[PDB]
Amino acid sequence: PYPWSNAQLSWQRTAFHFQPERSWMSDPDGPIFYKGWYHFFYQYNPDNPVWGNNTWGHTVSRDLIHWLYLPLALAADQWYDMQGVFSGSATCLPDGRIMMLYTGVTKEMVEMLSLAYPADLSDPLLVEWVKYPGNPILSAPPGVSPTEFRDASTGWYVSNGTWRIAIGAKYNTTGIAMVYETKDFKSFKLLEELLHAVPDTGLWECVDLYPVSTTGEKGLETSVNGPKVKHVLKASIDEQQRDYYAIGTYDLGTNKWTPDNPEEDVGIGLRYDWGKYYASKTFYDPKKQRRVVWAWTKELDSEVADREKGWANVQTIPRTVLLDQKTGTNVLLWPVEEVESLRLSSKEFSKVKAGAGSVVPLDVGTATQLDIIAEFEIDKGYNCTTSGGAAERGVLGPFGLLVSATENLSEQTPVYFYIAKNFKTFFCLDESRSSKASDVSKQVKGFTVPVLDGEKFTMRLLVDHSIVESFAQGGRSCITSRVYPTEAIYGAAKLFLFNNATGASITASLKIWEMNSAFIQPFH
């Protein structure tokens, strides 16, 4: 174990990502927009920076960036939720009501669905929450374990007052999504037809089903269906602690979701993010007509270090979700536009040359709170995970940026493109030399990314102390990770352009913004 100093640990706290004042935070819960405020709830341990004693924290903002702490929303305080309050989804009804479904756990570890709602709908801040006196409302059916019956989705409307929700589970090694019908969100009936199932995935947690447009650049309200509408089906794959999605079609008549590509079905195809990114939940934003995705990123250091610093885990910056209309076969994820309100000043680097085996310093001053947009051109089998990262030199890769780096590269975090031979483009993030400390993650993360005719290779990086978020080709591929440098901290952190290819030189242009604090604080 590394002997972390107070100064090394203090630096790890983020400037502009959501995290509570102290302690453990994890899964997103019941995100909504209501009466001028974006609302976010989250799993929270009041006692220690480890998983447990599960309650719901609550925060609000005008803009998805400038968060304000509110009082705890739900506590573990009844027999049916004494071992924790978990994974909630809100359904907002036409009459103005907000119905919050959650999973409560008993002393025996038995999981059951329960209902909560606001004490006062006239309160824009929704400070106080009440539990339905008829709780608990739903226990596991005969085919599903009562200790693994969790995570109701946001509802979608059918007809004649009937709504549907999804609950993920498994049968043996096959992941499944069950559907229940309700008219009041107090009593539920299980449908005979599953929404969908995929063999050899294991348990599906946190199932999400939502419409996306094939024509516009707006998100769609959750109950929208029709001819120019496709549906994303998403599941958190428990055995992998990773989130997978697929694009398909949902039929209200049959209650079946069918994949456009069975080879890329839920759990065996595309991910929202190829890094550390879990329990994602979307909601519809009526203010700017967007669909927004929340997800948490666990610490990648030791539990010993977490207990010493007194906190664990952060949320990514929320992202929009749209269908990629250029390909038709993936989604695009991109940080919400309000993140740009943090941009202080910019510096531009135009047509910088990097020959084979070169490293080029980029003088930006402090390099710990940044938004970076870069484009690369090559002047006139492989797998990120099993590769040697930036050290594995090929004819047409690797090339990209070094973030969280020292002057002499004693520590560095490469984010790069690698073109392999029909050519494939890989986009990867290399943790192998991110820190001199031995008890942190040292993996290479990534995947292929589609690069279309005439397109430059493009990446955007958000750098914020111990979290880095990366985006290729406008969000066709994303990679999120955590870094814990021992030396590349405060003024000692630097930024570089690099090209470790053997048979290509590159030309790059960059624009880099220093980023302000989000000033996350208590509501007054």
Ligand SMILES: *[C@@H]1O[C@H](CO)[C@@H](O[C@@H]2O[C@H](CO)[C@@H](O[C@@H]3O[C@H](CO)[C@@H](O)[C@H](O)[C@@H]3O)[C@H](O)[C@H]2NC(C)=O)[C@H](O[C@@H]2O[C@@H](C)[C@@H](O)[C@@H](O)[C@@H]2O)[C@H]1NC(C)=O
């Ligand atoms: C690129 O290389 C990586 C590393 O080898 C591949 O990921 C690995 O895939 C294995 C399956 O081929 C996984 O094995 C499983 O291990 C767990 C226990 O850890 C078992 O419970 C389970 O039954 C499997 O045996 C392995 O976990 C996984 N390693 C990592 C670090 O993720 C990768 O394969 C691709 O990703 C994985 C996650 C699966 O989705 C595969 O279907 C998929 O091919 C390689 N990529 C490619 C394109 O081949």
Ligand SMILES: *[C@@H]1O[C@H](CO)[C@@H](O[C@@H]2O[C@H](CO)[C@@H](O[C@@H]3O[C@H](CO)[C@@H](O)[C@H](O)[C@@H]3O)[C@H](O)[C@H]2NC(C)=O)[C@H](O)[C@H]1NC(C)=O
């Ligand atoms: C560009 O590619 C070269 C060639 O692979 C990289 O240099 C190589 O860097 C690796 C990793 O630092 C060296 O491997 C060794 O790893 C062990 C740990 O297992 C360590 O104890 C050694 O001290 C050493 O670091 C390797 O020797 C070195 N190879 C050569 C020929 O110099 C280079 O780092 C890459 N550039 C960038 C910016 O990443």
Ligand SMILES: *[C@@H]1O[C@H](CO)[C@@H](O[C@@H]2O[C@H](CO)[C@@H](O)[C@H](O)[C@H]2NC(C)=O)[C@H](O[C@@H]2O[C@@H](C)[C@@H](O)[C@@H](O)[C@@H]2O)[C@H]1NC(C)=O
């Ligand atoms: C999960 O795996 C179990 C073990 O293979 C399945 O039970 C087996 O089902 C066979 C018929 O498909 C039957 O010959 C075996 O005797 C039986 N084995 C045991 C130990 O029960 C199970 O299949 C479900 O449960 C059985 C009893 C039948 O009702 C099937 O129709 C069910 O599918 C597997 N579960 C699923 C959902 O596939």
Ligand SMILES: *[C@@H]1O[C@H](CO)[C@@H](O)[C@H](O[C@@H]2O[C@@H](C)[C@@H](O)[C@@H](O)[C@@H]2O)[C@H]1NC(C)=O
């Ligand atoms: C949840 O709260 C309870 C009661 O307040 C605490 O006892 C738990 O603390 C942990 O468990 C006890 C028995 C002891 O081992 C202590 O060292 C632990 O911190 C607390 N649990 C968690 C996971 O924070």
